Design an enzyme around this catalytic site. Structure first.
Site, short mmCIF file in Angstrom:
data_model
loop_
_atom_site.label_atom_id
_atom_site.label_comp_id
_atom_site.label_asym_id
_atom_site.label_seq_id
_atom_site.Cartn_x
_atom_site.Cartn_y
_atom_site.Cartn_z
N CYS A 39 0.87 -1.17 0.00
CA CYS A 39 0.00 0.00 0.00
C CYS A 39 0.91 1.23 0.00
O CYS A 39 1.73 1.38 -0.90
CB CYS A 39 -0.96 0.00 1.20
SG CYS A 39 -0.22 -0.30 2.83
N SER A 40 0.76 2.10 0.99
CA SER A 40 1.64 3.26 1.12
C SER A 40 2.86 2.91 1.98
O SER A 40 3.98 2.82 1.48
CB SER A 40 0.89 4.45 1.71
OG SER A 40 0.21 4.10 2.90
N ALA A 41 2.62 2.68 3.26
CA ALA A 41 3.69 2.34 4.19
C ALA A 41 3.92 0.83 4.27
O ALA A 41 4.93 0.37 4.80
CB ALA A 41 3.39 2.89 5.58
N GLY A 51 -0.67 -1.05 6.97
CA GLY A 51 -2.09 -0.91 7.25
C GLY A 51 -3.00 -1.74 6.36
O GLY A 51 -3.49 -2.79 6.78
N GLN A 105 -3.40 -1.63 11.30
CA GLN A 105 -3.16 -0.34 11.95
C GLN A 105 -4.28 0.13 12.88
O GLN A 105 -4.01 0.68 13.95
CB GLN A 105 -2.93 0.73 10.88
CG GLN A 105 -1.51 0.76 10.35
CD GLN A 105 -0.54 1.34 11.36
OE1 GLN A 105 -0.64 2.51 11.73
NE2 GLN A 105 0.38 0.51 11.83
#
Length: 488
Positions: A422-424, A427, A469
């Site tokens: 995903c992004s990081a 999550g 998350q």
């Protein structure tokens, strides 16, 4: 190690506690949702700092982004001068509320405790519950045996302190439990009341998921925070991600891969001093495995393809748009449809794109330059409709998505780990992986199997910190599992 978190405290109470029982440098963290607050005392006054988590990371206002609240606190306790309005984290103000401890059950009868300890408990299994007769007091119910028995130990509450009828008096149930875990009580006839493990209260049969969901919907938040309370119990280091040469290979500088499970890249160009790093971890259940990684940066695209090639990954799961809320969450690491591009020594052709309602499928061909016989097809599943904040209202789209992904993976002989990002990479990535792990068990075993959502998440978190998350994702996992079982 996480006593600084107070789950059931208000803003006023937090101020009260810091001003009367704390000093300058004292702090605590508390829930607001998905919002949290870091309350700190400084120069005889209390300040409150907002922490937001929409599902990707913990976002400290006037601070930085972190994978867990524990890593947030640890970071600033070790780095004076960086939390600013300068705000120092020196002394954790410990919480005495036992509600988030695995072994606490609250209101529970002696017979019911014996029942639960019988069906699920083993030797050393224990719990702490409220007194049935004497309000304010508590009971330590522990199972010992191979015959086996249950022993009930009375815990009196006198003048805000706890004891077992004699000896030391403790400030909290936690302190008392930890003491008699380390220093076991011995019965008159010699029985050692070992407190080995708390009684499991989350493992259930797959067919009873609906009953458990109803119970938790009446539950989710307290079970989630009980899991969050265990995040410090995991042994891991993040040194490689902290190396100077690796700093700009991280999308978020403080969100790092665990060293022991990180993907180590070989065959790097000997002219690059550090060429073995990518922000990614192997996730192995405990047959299919995963790689949980971040969305590519401009300078990590080549590393990404090195990873996919090396690990023989044949399926990629992308759970973000390239841009969300005007910010780049992942650079385009794939060529335009029908196009061919070289990413370092890796060559990729976009053979064909296929559009579904919730996702786009891209059939990619990956090979090493100068090496014809290394070509393989990599199927990129790009989920497009995940909301910017929070979780989907209905798990159907995600379930259908994962079901397709599963069958693609199963159809390829000796395919490597499924890449999820995903992004990081903690999550949405963690949420997709945990659902996939749980569904995998059910698909093979039907409703005749045990599932334990927080245990599974903890198992995944032991391989990459911060996996799953938010409480919204936690609940979504339950809803997805519930939906999948019913549609069998």
């Amino acid at each position: 190690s996480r006593r600084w978190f107070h789950p059931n405290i208000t803003g006023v109470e937090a101020e009260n506690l810091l001003l009367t029982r704390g000093v300058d440098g004292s702090f605590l963290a508390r829930p607001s949702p998905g919002d949290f607050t870091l309350s700190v005392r400084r120069n005889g006054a209390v300040t409150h700092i907002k922490i937001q988590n929409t599902g990707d990371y913990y976002d400290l206002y006037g601070g930085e982004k972190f994978a867990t609240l524990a890593e947030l606190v640890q970071y600033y306790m070790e780095h004076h001068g960086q939390l600013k309005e300068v705000i120092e984290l020196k002394y954790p103000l410990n919480c005495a509320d036992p509600t988030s401890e695995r072994w606490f059950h609250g209101h529970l009868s002696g017979k019911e405790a014996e029942k639960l300890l019988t069906e699920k408990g083993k030797h050393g299994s224990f719990l702490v519950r409220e007194s049935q007769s004497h309000p304010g007091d508590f009971v330590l119910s522990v199972r010992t045996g191979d015959k086996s028995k249950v022993t009930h130990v009375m815990i009196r509450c006198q003048e805000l302190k706890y004891d077992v009828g004699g000896g030391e008096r403790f400030d909290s149930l936690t302190d008392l439990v930890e003491h008699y875990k380390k220093n076991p009580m011995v019965e008159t006839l010699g029985t050692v009341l070992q407190l080995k493990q708390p009684l499991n209260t989350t493992r259930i049969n797959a067919a009873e998921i609906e009953s458990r969901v109803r119970e938790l919907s009446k539950g989710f938040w307290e079970e989630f925070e009980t899991l969050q309370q265990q995040e410090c119990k995991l042994l891991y280091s993040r040194k490689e991600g902290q190396r100077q040469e690796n700093k700009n290979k991280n999308r978020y500088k403080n969100i790092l891969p665990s060293d022991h499970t990180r993907v180590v890249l070989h065959d790097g160009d000997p002219n690059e001093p550090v060429s073995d790093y990518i922000n990614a971890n192997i996730i192995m259940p405990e047959k299919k495995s995963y790689i949980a990684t971040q969305g590519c940066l401009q300078n990590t695209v080549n590393d990404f393809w090195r990873m996919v090639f090396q690990e023989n990954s044949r399926v990629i799961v992308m759970t973000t748009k390239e841009v969300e809320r005007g910010k780049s969450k992942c650079v385009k690491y794939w060529p335009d449809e029908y196009a061919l591009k070289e990413y370092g020594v890796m060559r990729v052709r976009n053979v064909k794109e296929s559009a579904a309602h919730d996702y786009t499928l891209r059939e990619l061909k990956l090979s090493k330059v100068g090496q014809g016989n290394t070509e393989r097809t990599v199927w990129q599943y790009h989920f497009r409709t995940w909301p910017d904040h929070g979780v989907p209202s209905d798990p159907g789209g995600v379930l259908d998505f994962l079901e397709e992904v599963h069958h693609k993976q199963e159809s390829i002989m000796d395919a490597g780990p499924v890449v999820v990002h995903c992004s990081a990479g903690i999550g949405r990535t963690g949420t997709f992986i945990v659902i996939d792990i749980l569904i995998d068990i059910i698909r093979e075993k039907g409703v005749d199997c045990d599932i334990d959502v927080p245990k599974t998440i903890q198992m995944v978190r032991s391989q990459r910190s911060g996996m799953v998350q938010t409480e919204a994702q936690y609940r979504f996992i339950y809803m997805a599992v519930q939906h999948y079982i019913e549609t069998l």
